[PDB]
Structure formats: structure tokens, C-alpha cells
Amino acid sequence: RKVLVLGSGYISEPVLEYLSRDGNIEITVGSDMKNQIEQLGKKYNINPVSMDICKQEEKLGFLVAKQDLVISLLPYVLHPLVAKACITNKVNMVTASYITPALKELEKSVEDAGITIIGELGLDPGLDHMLAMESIDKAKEVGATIESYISYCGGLPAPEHSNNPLRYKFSWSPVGVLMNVMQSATYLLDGKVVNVAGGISFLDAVTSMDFFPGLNLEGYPNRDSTKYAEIYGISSAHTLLRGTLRYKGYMKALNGFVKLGLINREALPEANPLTWKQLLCDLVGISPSSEHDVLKEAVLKKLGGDNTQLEAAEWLGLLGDEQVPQAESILDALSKHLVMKLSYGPEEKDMIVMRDSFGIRHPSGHLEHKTIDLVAYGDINGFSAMAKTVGLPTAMAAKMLLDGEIGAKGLMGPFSKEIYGPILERIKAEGIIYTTQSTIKP
Amino acid sequence: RKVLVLGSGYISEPVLEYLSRDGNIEITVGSDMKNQIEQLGKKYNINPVSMDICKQEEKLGFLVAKQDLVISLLPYVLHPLVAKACITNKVNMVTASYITPALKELEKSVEDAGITIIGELGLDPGLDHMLAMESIDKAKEVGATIESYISYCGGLPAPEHSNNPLRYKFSWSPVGVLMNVMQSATYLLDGKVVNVAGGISFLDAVTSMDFFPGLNLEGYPNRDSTKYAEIYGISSAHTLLRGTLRYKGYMKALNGFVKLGLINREALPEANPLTWKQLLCDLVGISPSSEHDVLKEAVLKKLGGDNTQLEAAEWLGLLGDEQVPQAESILDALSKHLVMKLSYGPEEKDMIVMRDSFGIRHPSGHLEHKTIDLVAYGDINGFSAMAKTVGLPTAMAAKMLLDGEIGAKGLMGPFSKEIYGPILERIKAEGIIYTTQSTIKP
Ligand SMILES: O=S(=O)(NC[C@@H]1CCCN1)C(F)(F)F
Numbered sequence: 062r063k064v065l066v067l068g069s070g071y072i073s074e075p076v077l078e079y080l081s082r083d084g085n086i087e088i089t090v091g092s093d094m095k096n097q098i099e100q101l102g103k104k105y106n107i108n109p110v111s112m113d114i115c116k117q118e119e120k121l122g123f124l125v126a127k128q129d130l131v132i133s134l135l136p137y138v139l140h141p142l143v144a145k146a147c148i149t150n151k152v153n154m155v156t157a158s159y160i161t162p163a164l165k166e167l168e169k170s171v172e173d174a175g176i177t178i179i180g181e182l183g184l185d186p187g188l189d190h191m192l193a194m195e196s197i198d199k200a201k202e203v204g205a206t207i208e209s210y211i212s213y214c215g216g217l218p219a220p221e222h223s224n225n226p227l228r229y230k231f232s233w234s235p236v237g238v239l240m241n242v243m244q245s246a247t248y249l250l251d252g253k254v255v256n257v258a259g260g261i262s263f264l265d266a267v268t269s270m271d272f273f274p275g276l277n278l279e280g281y282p283n284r285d286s287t288k289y290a291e292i293y294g295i296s297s298a299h300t301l302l303r304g305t306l307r308y309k310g311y312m313k314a315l316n317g318f319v320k321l322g323l324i325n326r327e328a329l330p331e332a333n334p335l336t337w338k339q340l341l342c343d344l345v346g347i348s349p350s351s352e353h354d355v356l357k358e359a360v361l362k363k364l365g366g367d368n369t370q371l372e373a374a375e376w377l378g379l380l381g382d383e384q385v386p387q388a389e390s391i392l393d394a395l396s397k398h399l400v401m402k403l404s405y406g407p408e409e410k411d412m413i414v415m416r417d418s419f420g421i422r423h424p425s426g427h428l429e430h431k432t433i434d435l436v437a438y439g440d441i442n443g444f445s446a447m448a449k450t451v452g453l454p455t456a457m458a459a460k461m462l463l464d465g466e467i468g469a470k471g472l473m474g475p476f477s478k479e480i481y482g483p484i485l486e487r488i489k490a491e492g493i494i495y496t497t498q499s500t501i502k503p
Numbered sequence: 504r505k506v507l508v509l510g511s512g513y514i515s516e517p518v519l520e521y522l523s524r525d526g527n528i529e530i531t532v533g534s535d536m537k538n539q540i541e542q543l544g545k546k547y548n549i550n551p552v553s554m555d556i557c558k559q560e561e562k563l564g565f566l567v568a569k570q571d572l573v574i575s576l577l578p579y580v581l582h583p584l585v586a587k588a589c590i591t592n593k594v595n596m597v598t599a600s601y602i603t604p605a606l607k608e609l610e611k612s613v614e615d616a617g618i619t620i621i622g623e624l625g626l627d628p629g630l631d632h633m634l635a636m637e638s639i640d641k642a643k644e645v646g647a648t649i650e651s652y653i654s655y656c657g658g659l660p661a662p663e664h665s666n667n668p669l670r671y672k673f674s675w676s677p678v679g680v681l682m683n684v685m686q687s688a689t690y691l692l693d694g695k696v697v698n699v700a701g702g703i704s705f706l707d708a709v710t711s712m713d714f715f716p717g718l719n720l721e722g723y724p725n726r727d728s729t730k731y732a733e734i735y736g737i738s739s740a741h742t743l744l745r746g747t748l749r750y751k752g753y754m755k756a757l758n759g760f761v762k763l764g765l766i767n768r769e770a771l772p773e774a775n776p777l778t779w780k781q782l783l784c785d786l787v788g789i790s791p792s793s794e795h796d797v798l799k800e801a802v803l804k805k806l807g808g809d810n811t812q813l814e815a816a817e818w819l820g821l822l823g824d825e826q827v828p829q830a831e832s833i834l835d836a837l838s839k840h841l842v843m844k845l846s847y848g849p850e851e852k853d854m855i856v857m858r859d860s861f862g863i864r865h866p867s868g869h870l871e872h873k874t875i876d877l878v879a880y881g882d883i884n885g886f887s888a889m890a891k892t893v894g895l896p897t898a899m900a901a902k903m904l905l906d907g908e909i910g911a912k913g914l915m916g917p918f919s920k921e922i923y924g925p926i927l928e929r930i931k932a933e934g935i936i937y938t939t940q941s942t943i944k945p
């Protein structure tokens with residue numbers, strides 16, 4: 062009855078709250094942030110420990126050995142360090158984010174030690190694996206095969222808080238999501254691989270998502286959907302598509318930022334602090350002076366008179382005299398400013414929407430078109446929908462390892478019925494409900 | 504510490520739950536429905552009493568005399584009967600629905616008896632009066648006058664349950680809302696009274712409501728918005744508009760039902776039960792036979808090939824072989840069928856959206872454009888947003904009369920700060936939050 066929660070804040074809160082319900086468990090918390098762990102310590106009964114994972118690797122080995130399970134809530138590049146500690150000692154692990162290629166190399170060492178390491182847990186990845194494999198196993202139970210798998214997911218504000226230029230509010234730093242617009246998107250469609258161009262042209266791949274008539278959604282494909290054939294075992298499927306959901310207008314606003322030259326990792330531009338008007342004067346290539354003059358330069362650069370994108374930049378204060386935050390690049394400076402202007406206030410709900418669609422060919426010959434809807438809202442005096450959907454699957458999988466319900470050993474995701482069955486059942490009690498519907502087509 | 508709740512089911516549940524928190528209060532319940540009061544008695548500790556209000560008026564007088572307050576949750580035509588009982592005895596009253604002209608005649612008798620009767624309590628009417636008068640009093644505190652008052656309100660499904668032809672699910676019978684499409688809409692706009700034609704042409708008055716970009720809303724005006732000048736004391740205002748909110752496509756689907764001849768109070772049409780295909784054959788004027796034949800007759804009648812309206816009727820089963828419910832008219836038969844096909848399941852959320860907009864002229868000369876947003880969702884293992892917004896204002900006003908906080912006497916709405924101030928404060932704790940924002944225009 063003892064666990065180490067590496068990392069703190071936001072994702073940790075529901076993990077600590079869920080584990081501390083029974084009482085018979087000692088929560089230890091390791092963290093780099095000094096102020097955050099102190100604030101987290103006030104809410105939940107824990108043992109505060111301050112440590113860097115890379116620098117203080119010696120004390121990690123001794124601390125990890127004292128526990129029954131390590132819950133890593135750190136960035137996914139640092140999992141080889143925590144896995145290196147966990148394989149040496151006799152101790153299990155659970156991971157929120159992806160299982161990287163670096164962590165996949167340890168699978169030989171992990172199985173030899175006789176321990177269980179569960180990765181790919183949370184919303185996405187996580188619940189996407191669980192809902193997919195539930196349906197895929199149900200199809201295999203009756204001899205049926207998967208012909209198509211389309212799955213869209215999105216974390217976004219509740220409709221009442223969608224009235225801004227991006228129709229969005231940021232939970233954490235947008236450096237990743239902004240850079241994903243520059244990245245490509247590969248997916249399979251009707252036995253043909255479709256590569257989509259990132260950057261300026263990525264707006265052309267955006268489509269209207271009309272599965273909820275009342276909800277004004279757009280969609281676009283993720284970075285790589287072809288990998289799910291090997292993961293789920295559905296290489297016979299002619300269509301594999303995975304995408305992200307936003308409200309309509311989001312990608313067009315980011316397309317504005319791409320035109321202006323804001324989405325890049327170049328450094329910032331003598332004896333006076335750099336304001337946003339002065340930075341945009343640099344990009345459009347004029348002297349730092351006159352606000353009505355840069356308006357003419359910016360609107361000219363943002364296509365043939367795109368007033369919507371001009372107003373989006375005006376609303377956020379990109380043409381104003383506010384100071385540019387100190388940062389390593391222009392993209393990092395933009396990200397800090399967007400976090401400042403578009404964040405969730407204390408009484409503002411977020412939303413998690415997730416929509417799957419399966420084409421299932423039965424042995425009879427007919428095609429079942431199965432759909433899954435998962436929609437959750439944040440609680441006012443409680444956890445956000447993002448925190449619950451990311452936190453609870455990792456927290457529940459952790460409790461299942463301590464109780465001794467998961468008998469399997471080695472490195473793995475939540476793909477087996479042993480893992481996904483109990484989790485999907487238990488998240489219903491926490492207010493994460495998913496419905497199902499299917500129709501037959503002869 | 505004793506009250507009589509006339510009427511039961513849906514609206515009563517949150518009223519009984521709110522009043523029974525402290526414990527020091529005896530809940531009595533009068534009702535016409537025998538099965539409903541028994542089911543309600545299982546959940547909350549009450550005294551079941553079965554009675555018709557009109558027929559058994561003798562026992563009402565004796566039962567009402569035993570109580571401290573009568574909470575009427577009946578149809579609004581029956582309030583003169585309950586008011587006639589309450590004025591005779593020394594006892595207060597609270598009312599959910601409108602204060603009718605018939606109830607307004609008793610105001611002389613009500614004041615002479617030395618009692619308090621609060622009407623117009625709930626969502627709409629109710630919270631519309633409270634939010635309006637809060638802003639209007641705040642304007643009068645700084646010498647400012649109201650130039651415009653626009654206020655849209657709507658009870659509808661949460662976006663995830665909007666995928667049907669009406670984008671709607673009915674909480675109670677739709678005979679009222681369907682008949683309101685046939686009724687006119689009067690309102691004031693820029694010092695000019697605007698009368699809108701009901702029926703077939705009412706679709707032309709429907710407008711896009713874009714205050715939440717993520718929410719795909721339509722709006723249309725209510726039956727009479729000119730009366731709020733006298734009620735709020737804003738006769739100087741050049742614009743008075745009150746409307747109802749739905750998801751886009753709702754009024755166009757009802758417009759389909761108007762074209763087909765379904766929205767009317769004519770009676771139903773020998774030795775075999777009447778099906779929906781046979782009823783639509785009567786209306787389009789063909790023999791009761793062949794489903795593909797009536798499809799051609801119906802689509803011809805529903806404008807020049809309106810396939811959307813044809814599919815809406817097809818989806819609901821209006822061209823199928825299901826039996827028409829027993830009813831006094833075609834509209835009543837349609838209403839029973841729509842309740843059957845489009846209702847809330849146990850785990851399905853509803854939504855209350857409400858949006859006000861004030862043009863406030865200050866003594867300085869400038870114009871304040873103030874806006875109010877109120878959005879609430881139904882709880883999964885709890886009350887619906889409709890039940891909370893309708894029930895709690897009546898329940899809170901009832902508690903304030905028993906505690907002796909409302910000192911005023913006579914017949915009234917919730918217009919004074921004495922009533923609306925404490926209620927708006929207390930509904931925040933129950934999960935009904937409203938935000939405010941304003942901008943100055945020189
Ligand atoms: O960015 S999201 O909308 N969804 C993340 C998923 C997985 C990667 C791309 N789409 C978030 F809000 F959930 F983070």
C-alpha cells in the first residue's frame with residue numbers, strides 16, 4: 062500500500078483523489094516544481110519530495126525500491142529513466158502518455174524482471190484504445206472482421222465558452238498543437254495511402270463534422286493513422302483514419318498565424334522592451350511605428366483582404382503595445398501569449414467529445430456500421446473533463462495492479478479485455494458515459 | 504412548518520428535495536394522478552392525498568387551512584380556485600406559471616386578507632424577470648435608462664443528443680409549442696411595432712443566433728414582447744424583443760408538418776385500426792394503399808421536392824404502419840407520437856440556454872451594451888436542467904416566505920430586489936451560474 066506519483070498538477074489531482082478514497086495507501090509525490098507540489102500537498106495527504114529525474118538519478122533508485130508502484134505523470138521522453146529504475150528493482154509502473162520507441166527497447170529487460178508496465182493510458186492515447194478494442198473483440202467474437210475504422214477526438218470548451226477568435230481555451234501550453242499544423246498527416250482510405258501536406262495548405266484538409274447537428278464542429282486528420290493496423294490487428298481494413306475535433310473557425314485562425322510568420326522556432330529580434338506591434342512590424346517588414354499602418358501591412362499579408370484573420374490578431378493584442386513574453390522563439394512567445402489570453406477561469410466548463418465509426422463485415426456477408434459517442438463536461442466544483450478522462454484510466458489501472466486483478470506481465474497498452482473491461486465499467490460511475498448504436502446494410 | 508404541494512411529478516421533485524433538506528417541515532402533496540403520487544411518495548417523505556381541485560373544492564378549504572403555505576404546481580387556469588381557498592383562510596401561496604387576468608382580479612381580496620402570493624416563478628417566466636430587473640435596477644442606481652431589451656431563452660437537448668429530425672426531445676406534451684407556430688408574434692423594434700404572421704409564413708421570421716459559435720442555434724420571437732414595458736417599467740425603450748431558442752432545422756421540420764396539414768384541432772377520420780400511412784393518405788387525398796405511392800403524394804405536398812421534410816416524416820414513422828394514438832384531434836395525435844419517439848432516456852442530458860442583451864443609456868450620454876449568459880446542463884444521477892430552473896425558484900421563494908424574509912404583502916411577481924437577490928444568489932450553489940459582460944460605446 063505505497064505508490065510514487067512522479068510529476069504533479071492537473072493530471073495528478075484526480076489520480077490522488079481516486080487512490081485516496083479507501084485510505085489504506087501511502088501517496089508519495091516526486092516533482093520538479095517547488096510551488097506546485099506545496100499547493101497539491103494542501104489538498105491531498107501526501108509525502109512531498111523535490112527532485113529532478115535526470116540529475117538526481119541516485120535517490121530515484123532508492124525511493125522507487127521503497128514503493129509498490131510508480132505512477133509516471135511526466136513528459137514521455139523521461140520514461141526510459143523511470144523504466145530503468147523500475148526494471149532494476151522489483152516494482153511495477155503505469156504511464157499516461159505514449160510508449161516511445163526508446164521504452165519499447167526495454168521490453169526484453171522488463172519481462173525478465175517479472176513486472177508489469179502499462180502504458181498508453183488516459184484519453185488519447187488510452188480511451189481510444191479501450192473503446193476500439195472493445196468493439197473489435199465483439200466483432201471477433203462473432204467471426205466478423207474490421208473493414209473501416211474512423212475515430213475523431215477533441216478536448217475543447219463547452220459551447221457557452223466558445224466566443225473567441227480560436228473558439229478555444231488552453232489547458233496547457235499550445236506549442237505542440239500549433240506545431241502539428243506544420244506537420245503532415247498520413248492515413249489509409251479505400252486501400253490507398255493519403256499523405257496530407259502540412260503548413261499553409263493544411264486548411265484544405267479541414268472538413269465539417271456534422272454527427273451532432275447542434276454542435277458546430279470541424280475536423281482534420283492526425284499525424285499518422287496507418288500505425289493502428291499493427292496495434293489493433295486490423296491490417297485487412299481498407300480505411301484507417303484518426304483525427305482531431307475543434308469548433309468551426311479554429312484552423313482558419315491558425316492559418317492566419319501561419320501566413321504572418323508566427324509559427325516557427327526562429328529567435329526573437331535595442332534599449333526598450335519588445336511589444337507585439339513591434340514584432341509584427343518586423344515580420345511584415347516595416348518600421349516599428351504607427352498602429353493603423355501595420356494594420357494595412359498585416360491585412361495585405363493575410364491573403365486578399367481576410368478581415369476575419371485581421372480581427373483575430375487584433376482581438377488577441379498582436380497589433381497592440383503589450384510586451385512580448387521572454388522566450389526561446391516566436392512560436393514559444395505566441396504560445397505564452399495565447400495561454401495568457403485564452404485560459405479557463407475557475408467556473409468555466411471544458412468538454413471532451415469523441416466519436417468512433419466501424420465498418421464490420423460479418424461472416425454472413427452483411428456490413429454492420431457501428432458508431433460510438435463519448436461526451437463529458439467538466440464539473441463546476443470538481444474536476445475538468447480533460448483531467449477526468451486523462452487521469453482516471455491511469456489511476457484505475459494503478460489500483461487494478463495493486464489489488465492484483467491484472468495477471469499479465471511485461472510492457473503493454475490497455476488492449477486486452479483484462480484491462481479495458483474493468484476501466485470502461487468503472488469510468489461510468491465517475492460520469493464518463495459512452496453510448497453505442499449500429500445498423501445493418503445488405 | 505407545513506406546506507401543501509398541489510400537483511406532482513417532474514417540477515415537484517426538486518421542490519420536495521430542496522424543502523426537505525433541513526427536516527423541520529411537513530410536506531403534504533395533493534394530486535389528480537394516482538400512480539404518480541405513489542411513485543413520488545417512495546422517493547420523498549410526504550403525506551399522499553388524492554383529489555380533483557374543481558370537483559372536491561370542499562376538502563381543499565379544510566386542507567389549505569391546516570397549512571402555512573400552498574405551493575401550486577398545477578396548470579395556470581386552476582389558480583383562481585387555489586387563490587379562492589388561500590384568500591379565505593390565513594395562508595400564503597406560491598405559483599410557478601403565469602399570473603393570469605383571472606388571478607389579477609383577486610388582488611383586492613388578496614391584500615385585504617393580509618397575505619403574500621408570489622407568481623411568475625421558475626425559468627420562463629421567472630428567471631427572465633429576475634435577471635432583467637437585476638440589470639434594470641443596477642442601471643437605475645446610476646441614473647441610467649433602458650433603450651433596448653432583447654432576451655432569448657430555450658430548453659433543449661445537450662448537443663450530443665441533437666441528432667434527430669427536430670434536433671429535440673420533449674420533456675412534456677408539445678401541444679402548446681406546436682400551436683405557438685400557428686400563433687402570431689408581436690414585438691417593438693426602433694419605435695415601431697412589428698407583427699409577425701404565424702402558420703406557414705412563420706419560418707420567414709426565424710434567424711441565426713450566433714452568440715456561441717460552437718452552438719448551432721436558431722431563434723424566433725415569442726407571442727407578445729410589448730407587455731414587458733409596463734411590467735419592468737421601461738416604456739422609454741425603443742426595442743423590446745423576447746424569443747425562443749432551438750437548434751437549426753427545428754422550425755423547418757415543423758414547417759413540414761404545417762404543409763402536410765398535421766397542425767390543427769380537427770377530429771380523426773371502418774373495422775380496422777387507423778395507422779399513420781392511412782392518416783397521411785387522407786390528408787394528401789389518396790386511397791389508403793401503397794407506401795411508395797404516398798411518398799410521391801407527400802413530397803409533392805411538402806413544397807417543390809423538399810426531401811429533408813420528407814425524410815423527417817419518414818424517420819418519425821408518419822408514412823409507416825404504426826397505429827395512430829387515440830386522441831381528440833390530429834395535433835393531439837401527432838403530439839402523443841412525438842412524445843413516444845423523441846423523449847429523454849434515463850442517462851440523457853438536457854440543456855437550458857438563456858441570453859439577454861441590454862442597451863443602457865447613462866446620464867453621461869454613452870451607451871452601455873450589457874449581455875448576460877445563463878447555461879445549465881442536467882445532472883446524470885440528479886435533476887434535469889429544466890427541473891432545476893423551473894423548480895428551484897418556486898421552492899426558494901417558498902422557503903423565504905416560511906422563514907419570513909419577504910416582508911411585502913399582496914399579489915406580485917419576483918420583480919423586487921427582496922425576492923430576486925436572494926434567489927439568484929442561492930441558485931449559484933445549486934449549479935445554475937450566469938455570467939455578465941458589458942462594453943461602452945461613445
Ligand atoms: O489535442 S486534443 O484536442 N486531442 C488530442 C488527440 C491526440 C493527438 C491529436 N488529437 C486535447 F485537447 F485533448 F488535448
Ligand SMILES: O=S(=O)(NC[C@@H]1CCCN1)C(F)(F)F
Pocket residue numbers: 626627628656657658659680725746747748
Ligand atoms: O419552450 S421552451 O424552450 N422555452 C419557453 C419560453 C417561454 C415561452 C416561449 N419561450 C422550454 F423548453 F423551456 F419549455
